Ligand binder design. Structure first.
Ligand SMILES: CCC(C)(C)c1nn(CCO)c2c1N=C(c1ccc(-n3ccnc3C)cc1)CNC2=O
Ligand SMILES: CCC(C)(C)c1nn(CCO)c2c1N=C(c1ccc(-n3ccnc3C)cc1)CNC2=O
Ligand SMILES: CCC(C)(C)c1nn(CCO)c2c1N=C(c1ccc(-n3ccnc3C)cc1)CNC2=O
Ligand SMILES: CCC(C)(C)c1nn(CCO)c2c1N=C(c1ccc(-n3ccnc3C)cc1)CNC2=O
Ligand SMILES: [Mg+2]
Ligand SMILES: [Mg+2]
Ligand SMILES: [Mg+2]
Ligand SMILES: [Mg+2]
Ligand SMILES: [Zn+2]
Ligand SMILES: [Zn+2]
Ligand SMILES: [Zn+2]
Ligand SMILES: [Zn+2]
Lengths: 340, 335, 327, 336
């Protein structure tokens, strides 16, 4: 089945990006609307449109195999699946199309960001770093001493794909350019650990305050981290219907984890405990404390990113507005108090 | 045989427009058309062309497999056929090629055909209690009947003119045998119960397409899903199968009593309360299997819902096992 | 059924060589041994049934150089010698000794002159049926034995109590499985421990382990006779091994050195077998049974003889034809 | 195939491999590579680990072949290194009577760690990983022992491969203990680690090993692992000379790569600067002899090992002069 997919990807030609959807390159576009079966071709279309295939003389058979392998490397938990990776990668493309990234970052850096987006949650098992440590998982055996357990795994999985015969999209690169690409993928993927973001937050604030300096290599590193985080959280920048659906997915995933924690006798965090978690309040707190400040930083650095912050702000207000619906007024639709 | 050869392999649609739907009841097919249906399904999955299987050999194999079933009330050829049909349904309705190798799915279907060969309508404990030759040969390794079924399959493949795999490469031939052994052994309910927590673990972490143990576990789950598939149809199927199953069980119990042994409650026709037994089997054995299948394949949700609906039907007809008033003949002679 | 003394006055001695008995007289010798151990009378074994059983077992051996009926017969005879000289009734239940003897008769049924790994590498039906459980040939031998018992007129145990019938089956299975050399090597440390602490007749696990060790000592008993026996058996064994190697070569495989007639150096291989496998077994037997010391002595003396004739495998002077036309 | 025979034949009695197999004088690199997997099984059987840990024989056979397959083929850090190190572990077990000092599970962990301790080595050292910014250094960024963290990770991947879990018999508690023991022991193979603990090892040797002291167990495991890793120095002249050839080939290859990259190699890795006999004598005096003296201090029965290493050191001094060309080269030519 992967064989036949590959055959079509390679021999059919790369679909023009404009044939995917008329609004494909707009911040309003919702990539989750694309059928999953169309997504590997859409990755090829974006890579083509950003000129990466020609600029880096990426081998077409290799690229087709790599894209399919990355897709195959995602499991199917409610949120951390290939459609999340696809939507994150699409947002990277949007930033490229809409924010003039070539004025801030090196070509190889923008390339690294996009490839990292595709790979950044590889082999996610629907549980977080704390769970790896508490459950004494294999991944914690490997990586707990360094921290960012899952992110180290995702990076390791990306390298394992590249090291698979026929999949190394970078193997004609110079030793220096190869080393650079793999180092950028390390830094960017590790940047997806929200703990890392929180650590560097004041440094990001300082960068926005002083103004971005293109000749400052630390500015490049910080900006990459900020863009990766903005891609990861980008579902919050769409319409109400997207944020609502993404809340159902992420809390389903969390509460499944909470259920497993209880099953091993540990008290889950409130936010993972389906008996305690109050979703509107958790999502509001997340938006206020994490998401809004990110997109405000992005707006500070890229004036044309203002619409993103405004959508997150509006979505947070929507959560305040529907919160009252989490209180049962009258009787249930049942007409029954049996639930008591 | 002559009729299969004469007709050629029939397109699936010519059998029934609904043949590849979960709503379809394969037990409705006349027994004399089932071999044709096996070939049709294999053709529709393209296993014949893809593995370059010799067609007369396949016909001979299918008929020999069919012949290898006895005629107890439940564990007969129509059971093996309906189990094999469900495997085909899972191929057609779930994206099994997304999760399993082609050889894995082919071995699953062939295992379905063979998985109860020479069943005598008694269970493993009975073989041991009765000191059958089967127990003498297999009891120390466990899964007595399942080791026999696989041995019967090996005997069929090694019958002149029946070896559908005799042109496979050495590695693929060995692959088939290992797969069939594992899948057939997985049909022992005791085995399912032993691995249930590992199936749960797999559903919890999510199926890993690159984990060979997940492949093995998924094949076990699919096999058990096929074996119990009579529960995923409508009421009339679950009702009829209950009749057939309990007929078999009660005949076992009668034999155990004649041996001086106390049969299990569900095999003792003076103690077995069918509605309660059937409801517990459905709630605590079948539903958990179809819930696992659903967790792994969203599109399998209707199967779990159907088992739940049938379970509800049984709860609602339970009261009919209590004789209110007089029997229909107006007689108390039955006392 | 003929008395044992009528067969040969030395019949019950460790010095007796049962391979000296004509093959046409071996079935009667089986019945005579069973009668002498009083098993027929004690278990009320039906004689015509026993006779039919014995002939079917004999018929169930093929004719490779080593793993044939005469092997099974010589193994069974050593079991009898153990009974007679070591007073086994002091150590095991009657049923266990009976099972041991019947197991000896059956333990290589339908052997093809090839080992377990050969069955697996050649993808024989036997490998298909048994490779996942291990001890491929031994599972076959046991299955062949079950098939014989279940042939009309051949079930020597069919009047036994269920407890005794089940015990017989379980013992036969366990003893036949113990004849896999891989099994012996795996349990060797447990046999050593039993020998060191001392055999406890009230310990059922000691009963089990001792049954394994006696079976193994029956299986290798050709090493406990004189020179002519160990010499002849080496010939038969290496014929089998080299034919297996030849088949492996024709399959595009590389045989182990010992089965490669172009590499095998027989005296080296024979001496290693005797020193590292056979001698340790007979040494343990001596630890448990001081009356078995002569057996260990014979194996050790035979090993010495092999060392003494090793030089003959190097061509000194000229070949008998006075030609170097082999170079 | 090879697997078929490994599984379906018996495990060969250890004494049948070679009459001198269990002696400190035995050179395990003399065993053909094709026989080493079976020798591994023979050793595990003789140490009774197959018994005490109820190890499924198919599982053990697959594990042994998977570990062998996990070694690449640089001059020194290959499977035959792992084999010789494992064989030395067995020699210590047999000659030093380790069951009187360590718990069974500790000795088991030591042996498996010997097998696995250089998995996937490419003939480059920890310095190389950092300087070159490899994936390994990218993962294991916080402390050193980059390669050792990776060797452990490879061992874990093997144990987690369907059909290779030789630890399946352990309780979850003992499984965790085993994993943590393997990490500790494999990390002890970083010579930097040995150098850090050297003073504590001397203290332990001076006061004497206490089996009731948990720290003593940890320290003994480290010293035993190091003693296995350097065991090529405890054989004859021929072995120390051949191992020198292999390790120095590996060092110089790394150096050539470093030069090409724009990094200056350590002198010992620069084929234009390195003087092997000085380098080797320094290693023998300052690293190897002190390890075997510690072993001898803890275990009188280990005295011959230190004596051999000391003697091998003196042999290097004797032949050192041969590295300055006196007379004409072999070919009678000054064309060089
Ligand atoms: C950024 C972290 C990852 C990726 C898990 C994440 N993605 N997304 C999707 C973005 O489109 C969400 C995520 N995390 C959430 C989250 C985190 C923390 C807390 N938290 C903890 C203590 N206190 C609070 C409020 C609450 C809720 C849940 N909601 C989300 O929307
Ligand atoms: C005959 C065995 C297999 C599982 C194949 C089987 N098929 N079918 C046909 C299903 O379409 C049935 C089967 N097994 C039954 C069964 C099993 C377990 C238990 N059991 C034990 C402890 N606890 C419970 C509830 C009870 C009843 C009986 N009823 C059935 O419907
Ligand atoms: C054929 C198997 C049994 C053990 C029954 C057997 N009988 N006999 C007849 C004895 O009277 C022999 C047997 N086995 C032999 C044998 C076994 C192992 C190994 N081996 C492997 C690794 N290392 C060694 C030493 C070598 C040689 C071959 N020689 C024999 O004499
Ligand atoms: C354990 C460390 C590894 C694997 C690198 C190693 N093994 N082996 C094989 C042991 O049997 C050797 C190793 N290292 C060597 C070495 C190290 C340091 C120095 N050196 C220079 C100035 N000062 C010192 C201490 C010289 C030489 C080279 N010679 C070796 O024998
Ligand atoms: Mg992530
Ligand atoms: Mg069955
Ligand atoms: Mg045998
Ligand atoms: Mg190392
Ligand atoms: Zn993400
Ligand atoms: Zn069935
Ligand atoms: Zn034999
Ligand atoms: Zn090493």
């Amino acid at each position: 089945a992967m064989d036949d997919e590959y055959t079509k990807l390679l021999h059919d030609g790369i679909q023009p990006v404009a044939a995917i959807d008329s609004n494909f390159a707009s911040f309003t576009y919702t990539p989750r609307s694309l059928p999953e079966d169309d997504t590997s071709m859409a990755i090829l279309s974006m890579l083509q449109d950003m000129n990466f295939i020609n600029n880096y003389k990426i081998d077409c058979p290799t690229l087709a195999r790599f894209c399919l392998m990355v897709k195959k490397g995602y499991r199917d938990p409610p949120y951390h699946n290939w459609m999340h990776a696809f939507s994150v990668s699409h947002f990277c493309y949007l930033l490229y199309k809409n924010l003039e990234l070539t004025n801030y970052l090196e070509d190889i850096e923008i390339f690294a960001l996009f490839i990292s987006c595709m790979c950044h949650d590889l082999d996610h098992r629907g549980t977080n770093n704390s769970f790896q440590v508490a459950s004494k998982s294999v991944l914690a055996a490997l990586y707990s001493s360094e921290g960012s357990v899952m992110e180290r795994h995702h990076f390791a999985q990306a390298i394992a794909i590249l090291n698979t015969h026929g999949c190394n999209i970078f193997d004609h690169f110079s030793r220096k350019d190869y080393q650079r690409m793999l180092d950028l993928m390390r830094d960017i993927i590790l940047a997806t650990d929200l703990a890392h973001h929180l650590r560097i937050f004041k440094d990001l604030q300082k960068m926005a305050e002083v103004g971005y300096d293109r000749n400052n290599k630390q500015h490049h590193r910080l900006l990459l981290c900020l863009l990766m985080t903005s891609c990861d959280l980008s579902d919050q920048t769409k319409g109400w219907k997207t944020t609502r659906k993404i809340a159902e997915l992420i809390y389903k995933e969390f509460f499944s984890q909470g259920d497993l924690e209880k099953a091993m006798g540990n008290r889950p965090m409130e936010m993972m405990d389906r008996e305690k978690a109050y979703i509107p309040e958790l999502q509001i707190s997340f938006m206020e404390h994490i998401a809004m400040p990110i997109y405000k930083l992005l707006q500070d650095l890229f004036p044309k990113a203002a619409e993103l912050y405004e959508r997150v702000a509006s979505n947070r207000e929507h959560w305040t507005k529907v919160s009252h619906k989490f209180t049962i007024r009258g009787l249930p639709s049942n007409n029954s108090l049996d639930f008591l």
